[PDB]
UniProtKB/Swiss-Prot annotation, chain B:
An annotated Gene Ontology molecular function: DNA-binding transcription activator activity
Organism: Pseudomonas aeruginosa (strain ATCC 15692 / DSM 22644 / CIP 104116 / JCM 14847 / LMG 12228 / 1C / PRS 101 / PAO1)
Entry's Gene Ontology BP terms: positive regulation of DNA-templated transcription; quorum sensing; regulation of DNA-templated transcription; regulation of elastin catabolic process; regulation of gene expression
Additional facts recorded: LasR in strain PA103 is not active, this is probably due to the change in position 180 of the sequence.
Function summary: Transcriptional activator of elastase structural gene (LasB). Binds to the PAI autoinducer.
Classification lineage: Bacteria, Pseudomonadati, Pseudomonadota, Gammaproteobacteria, Pseudomonadales
Protein name (record): Transcriptional activator protein LasR
Organism domain of life: Bacteria
């Protein structure tokens, strides 16, 4: 569980519980983003978490949903995409990487979310590490737990967002 | 990552037979007995014509289709509503018809286990059902809890690769 996320009422308590679950697991920053069936309106997604506010604003401002390589990945797969240097291919994606890094978001992964009612989302989690090798060792050590977490977060958060 | 290397063979297969053999072995190696992987394309409710993989007794699968059990199987309705597992507990069989279903499934050797709902990136709807042989439900539940995180990863790997084989 999942216990607290269900007993919670309102976005504020739900966000605090999810953030703490991630933090306890070893991830300092998280974003839970969700769209309803047949929506591509990323700039109006249901968004939860503790990403820096200025970064979230810039992301929307710059239209980074069209650039961020994890977005297109999420439309095609249920498997995680790790924030590996190989995913940033274009010059725009290089800038995206640099800008996200400035915001403190360099190491992490994005778990695509695909709900029972056609919801489309992502749970992104970032880790503080001394290098990418350290980050990857940590992420591998907690991956099975994260994999369960993302589905619990999806089932709970879909109803909060749209119902 | 070494953790997920096992799951990579699911994309390295050529054809439904090899894919089925790989999936069945991963499940068997993990400690489960019988499995059924079922998948439908976007918008489909045609359970009698799903893409199905596994080692459920053939006569049972034939019976399930014939008797229209998809209409009453509580794991089916659950999968339309949720991404979370549904464990095969007496409490999920509520209607008299679902009691019949449970009795018939038990005769086919399917009593303890769980169903992982599958929801694909392209609207695919499915289930990965796995049965457990045990002396009682408590032992069965103890085993299932011990392998659940591995199974949770497996079901998504199976879905991603399975969808390509079924529809792409
Ligand atoms: O929430 C979604 O996308 C978003 C939205 Br909107 C806003 C923001 Br800010 C961030 C994301 C997802 N991207 C990341 O978190 C990320 C991934 C790799 C490197 C760096 C970052 N980062 O720092 O942002 C989303 C993605 C796919 C499908 C649906 C949604 Cl709603
Ligand atoms: O494959 C799907 O449904 C099916 C289809 Br067809 C055929 C068969 Br035989 C079995 C199922 C799923 N049911 C089970 O495996 C099950 C669950 C609990 C107790 C006993 C059993 N059982 O032994 O049958 C399915 C389910 C949800 C969404 C899509 C699909 Cl294709």
């Amino acid at each position: 569980g999942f216990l607290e996320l269900e007993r919670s009422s309102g976005k504020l308590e739900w966000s605090a519980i999810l953030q703490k679950m991630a933090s306890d697991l070893g991830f300092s920053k998280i974003l839970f983003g969700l769209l309803p069936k047949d929506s591509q309106d990323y700039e109006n997604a249901f968004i939860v978490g503790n990403y820096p506010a200025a970064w979230r604003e810039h992301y929307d401002r710059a239209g980074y949903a069209r650039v961020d390589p994890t977005v297109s990945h999420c439309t095609q797969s249920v498997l995680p995409i790790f924030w590996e240097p190989s995913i940033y291919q274009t010059r725009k994606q290089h800038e995206f990487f640099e800008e996200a890094s400035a915001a403190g978001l360099v190491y992490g992964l994005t778990m695509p979310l695909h709900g029972a009612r056609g919801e489309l989302g992502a749970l992104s989690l970032s880790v503080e590490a001394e290098n990418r090798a350290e980050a990857n060792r940590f992420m591998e050590s907690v991956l099975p737990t994260l994999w369960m977490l993302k589905d619990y977060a999806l089932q709970s958060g879909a109803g909060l967002a749209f119902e």
